[PDB]
Structure formats: structure tokens, C-alpha cells
Amino acid sequence: DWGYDDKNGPEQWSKLYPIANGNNQSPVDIKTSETKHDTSLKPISVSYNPATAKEIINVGHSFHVNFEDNDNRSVLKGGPFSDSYRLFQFHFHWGSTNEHGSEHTVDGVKYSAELHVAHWNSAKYSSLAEAASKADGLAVIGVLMKVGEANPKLQKVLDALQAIKTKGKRAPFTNFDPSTLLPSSLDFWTYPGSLTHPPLYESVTWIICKESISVSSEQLAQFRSLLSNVEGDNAVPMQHNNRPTQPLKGRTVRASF
Ligand SMILES: CC(=O)N1CCN(C(=O)c2ccc(S(N)(=O)=O)cc2)C[C@@H]1Cc1ccccc1
Numbered sequence: 001d002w003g004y005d006d007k008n009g010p011e012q013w014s015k016l017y018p019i020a021n022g023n024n025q026s027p028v029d030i031k032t033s034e035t036k037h038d039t040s041l042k043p044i045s046v047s048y049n050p051a052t053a054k055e056i057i058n059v060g061h062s063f064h065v066n067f068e069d070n071d072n073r074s075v076l077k078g079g080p081f082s083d084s085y086r087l088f089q090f091h092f093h094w095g096s097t098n099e100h101g102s103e104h105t106v107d108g109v110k111y112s113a114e115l116h117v118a119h120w121n122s123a124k125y126s127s128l129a130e131a132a133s134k135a136d137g138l139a140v141i142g143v144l145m146k147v148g149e150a151n152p153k154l155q156k157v158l159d160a161l162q163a164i165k166t167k168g169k170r171a172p173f174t175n176f177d178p179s180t181l182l183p184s185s186l187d188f189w190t191y192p193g194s195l196t197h198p199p200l201y202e203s204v205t206w207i208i209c210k211e212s213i214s215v216s217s218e219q220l221a222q223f224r225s226l227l228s229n230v231e232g233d234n235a236v237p238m239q240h241n242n243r244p245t246q247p248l249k250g251r252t253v254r255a256s257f
């Protein structure tokens with residue numbers, strides 16, 4: 001098993017998942033003096049249908065909002081891609097306190113939380129499972145969340161959490177377009193990287209937004225109040241789930257701007 005505790009956490013993952021020491025691991029620190037502007041990058045285009053929102057689920061180390069992904073109702077296009085990618089879930093990462101909690105960092109600066117909106121390459125593959133292990137299989141938009149003013153777009157998500165307090169609980173979560181959560185500029189960095197937790201496959205093209213979104217200190221507390229144990233056991237809050245940044249090992253981070 002794996003987690004974010006001391007015994008099962010990021011520093012220990014490589015014992016069970018050797019790819020943890022691979023060449024394309026995420027997240028990374030983006031050094032802006034080392035990024036390469038690429039004029040071939042097109043703008044990011046998202047087009048999500050709120051009827052594809054399906055279910056919210058407590059997965060023990062985090063929670064996920066999943067989407068119906070049987071057709072191209074909800075898709076990401078543009079940026080570095082020539083293929084359309086189909087939305088399947090979004091989720092967040094956060095830290096023990098407001099001082100850290102993002103996965104990616106920008107010039108060494110840690111944000112409080114990070115939103116991941118994850119998609120799979122339905123142009124080349126027939127399912128998420130096929131795509132998830134392929135170098136071109138996944139595309140995840142990362143948005144850095146800076147502690148400050150309450151973010152009212154987070155509301156439906158946060159209101160839903162009281163129905164999924166313990167590990168394994170799930171609930172319908174419908175009629176929601178997560179492009180409402182993205183910042184108003186979609187200027188971005190991109191690099192080839194991985195899932196940021198086991199199984200750690202190096203299958204993700206990262207799209208990291210330059211503009212942050214807000215989150216209040218009390219909104220972050222609602223995340224940390226989720227519990228990682230199952231109903232009826234001793235309560236164990238989900239205090240953090242961000243992985244430390246990993247070595248670029250020669251990759252280049254490109255900039256759209
Ligand atoms: C079971 C299993 O291995 N799963 C399903 C759950 N899962 C995610 O949803 C996911 C987690 C983190 C990130 S991140 N933080 O990199 O954006 C993005 C997506 C991981 C991973 C995908 C996956 C799906 C199907 C087959 C193999 C792999």
C-alpha cells in the first residue's frame with residue numbers, strides 16, 4: 001500500500017513503484033528563466049458539458065469528481081496537442097498548512113493547493129485504462145491555488161463533501177462544468193511528466209496555468225476535514241496529499257506566453 005504518511009509516503013514510493021525515480025516524474029519546479037517560449041503552441045480550448053458530471057468519491061487520500069467519458073461531450077483541444085482529449089475527473093491536492101500544498105512550484109514558490117483536471121487521449125485509445133500507461137495517453141491541467149479570498153466557484157464541490165466524509169463513500173455529482181474553476185487567462189507552461197502518485201506512470205502531458213485561482217483558509221480547512229479512515233473507525237483527517245517536486249532530468253518546460 002501507499003499514502004502520504006511517514007511509512008507509506010512519497011519518499012517510500014520507489015520501494016513498491018520503482019518508476020518513482022524515473023526520468024519524467026511530476027510534479028516539478030518551473031524555473032521561469034529556464035522555460036522555452038514555443039510559438040507553435042496553440043491556445044488551450046476546453047469545452048465541457050455539465051451533463052457529463054457523474055459522481056464524487058472519497059478515495060482515502062483525496063476525493064475525486066468523476067465524469068461520464070463514453071463520448072466527446074467534454075473535451076480539451078489545442079495547446080501542444082493535435083488529438084482531442086476527453087475529460088474524466090478533477091481533484092485537488094493540499095498541504096498540512098497554508099504555507100505549502102500545491103504540487104508544482106513556480107520559481108521555488110509553494111502555493112496552498114492545486115486543482116488537477118484530467119483527460120485521456122480518446123483519438124488514439126479506446127478507454128482510460130488503455131491510455132493511462134501510454135506516453136501520449138493523459139493530459140492534466142494544473143491550476144495553482146493561492147490562499148486569499150473565498151472562491152465561490154468552489155461552492156458546489158465543497159457543499160458535496162459532507163456526503164462523502166469517510167473512505168469509500170460516494171454520491172451523485174451532476175450538472176457541473178469544471179471549466180468554471182479555471183482562471184480567466186489560459187496562458188500556460190507544458191512539460192512531459194507523470195501521474196503524481198502511484199502508479200506514477202509517465203503518461204501525462206502537463207498544462208500548468210500561469211494565473212492562479214483563489215481559495216480561502218476556511219475552504220482549505222474543509223478539504224483537510226475529510227477523513228481517510230472508513231466509517232466507524234477512529235477519525236483520521238486527510239491533512240495533506242501533495243508530492244514534493246522531482247528532478248527535470250533534462251526535460252524542457254515550454255511556455256505559451
Ligand atoms: C487505478 C489507477 O491506477 N488509477 C485510477 C485513479 N487515478 C486517477 O484518477 C488520477 C490520479 C492522479 C492524477 S494526477 N495527480 O497526476 O493529476 C490524475 C489521475 C490514478 C490511476 C489512473 C489510471 C486509470 C486507469 C488505469 C491505470 C491508471
Ligand SMILES: [Zn+2]
Binds near residue numbers: 092116196
Ligand atoms: Zn493530482
